[PDB]
């Protein structure tokens, strides 16, 4: 971030439990809000788009309860962001991108969620989450309810790895760090 310079990319590429450990040591408030996130990263208000990313990003990392960063929530991201196994991540992707506490999904809530995540990137790239969501909905209808069960997510992945690869491909460290710096 914006502190004592120090290589950012390398830190992220080496990032381990030091960040997670650092958080606990700095203060066990229980949960860190957006300001706390911005505290670690430089550029308080680089752009409106950056704000959407944190908004969408917190929502995607919230996967737990509140919209704030809760204990274990950071380490979880760190634990998954690490090499590990791609297939394992996919499963990690499932617990998220859905209503808090997991459960079934439907058209509406998943749309705004994809809107924020696509909010951080889209347009020219045409790689928005919303656009992908529209395509996935087609030919994946289960019932009149229109709701999608963990089966749909797994089924979509099974039918193709384009989305599964995208979710895995989307996550990164330096790409995120470099984008913030601008
Ligand atoms: Mg949360």
What is the secondary structure of 56-119 as a DSSP string?
A: HHHHHHHTTSSSSEETTHHHHHHHHHSSS-HHHHHHHHHHSSSSTT---B-TTHHHHHHHHHHH
Whole-number Å distance, alpha carbon 19 to ligand 1 midpoint, is: 17
Residue 104 and residue 150: Cα distance in Å, rounded?
7
Q: Domain segments of the chain: what residues?
A: 1-83+171-182, 84-170
Residue 111 and residue 28: Cα distance in Å, rounded?
34
Query: Residue 147 corresponds to which tokens in the numbers above?
Result: 């709701």
Helices (H) and strands (E) in the chain, counts: 11, 2
Whole-number Å distance, alpha carbon 159 to ligand 1 midpoint, is: 31
Whole-number Å distance, alpha carbon 88 to ligand 1 midpoint, is: 21
DSSP letters, 2-27, are: -SS---HHHHHHH--SHHHHHHHHH-
Whole-number Å distance, alpha carbon 58 to ligand 1 midpoint, is: 7
Whole-number Å distance, alpha carbon 69 to ligand 1 midpoint, is: 5
Short-list 120, 125, 111, CA closest to 51: 120
Cα-Cα-Cα-Cα torsion 85, 90, 93, 97, nearest 10 degrees, comes to: 160
State the method.
NMR
Residue 14 and residue 16: Cα distance in Å, rounded?
6
- The protein residues having their C-beta less than 5 angstroms from ligand 1 (an ion) are 62, 64, 66
* Helices 109-119 and 48-62, packing angle to 10 deg: 130
Short-list 72, 60, 46, 73, CA closest to 180: 46
Query: Residue 85 corresponds to which tokens in the numbers above?
Result: 């196994």
């Amino acid at each position: 971030g914006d502190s004592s310079s120090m290589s950012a990319t390398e830190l992220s590429a080496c990032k381990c439990h030091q960040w997670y450990r650092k958080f606990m040591t700095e203060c066990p408030s229980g949960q860190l809000t957006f300001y706390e996130f911005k505290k670690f990263f430089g550029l308080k208000n680089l752009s409106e788009k950056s704000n959407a990313y944190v908004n969408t990003m917190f929502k995607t990392f919230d996967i737990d309860d509140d919209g704030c960063i809760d204990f274990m929530e950071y380490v979880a991201a760190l634990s998954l962001v690490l090499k590990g196994g791609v297939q394992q991540k996919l499963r990690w992707y499932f617990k998220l991108f859905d209503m808090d506490g997991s459960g079934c999904i439907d058209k509406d809530e998943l749309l705004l969620i994809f809107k924020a995540v696509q909010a951080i990137n889209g347009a020219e790239p045409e790689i928005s989450a919303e656009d992908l969501a529209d395509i996935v909905f087609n030919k994946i209808d289960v019932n009149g309810d229109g709701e999608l069960s963990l089966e749909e997510f797994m089924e979509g992945i099974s039918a193709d790895e384009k989305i599964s690869e995208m979710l895995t491909q989307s996550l990164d460290l330096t790409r995120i760090v470099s984008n913030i710096y601008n």
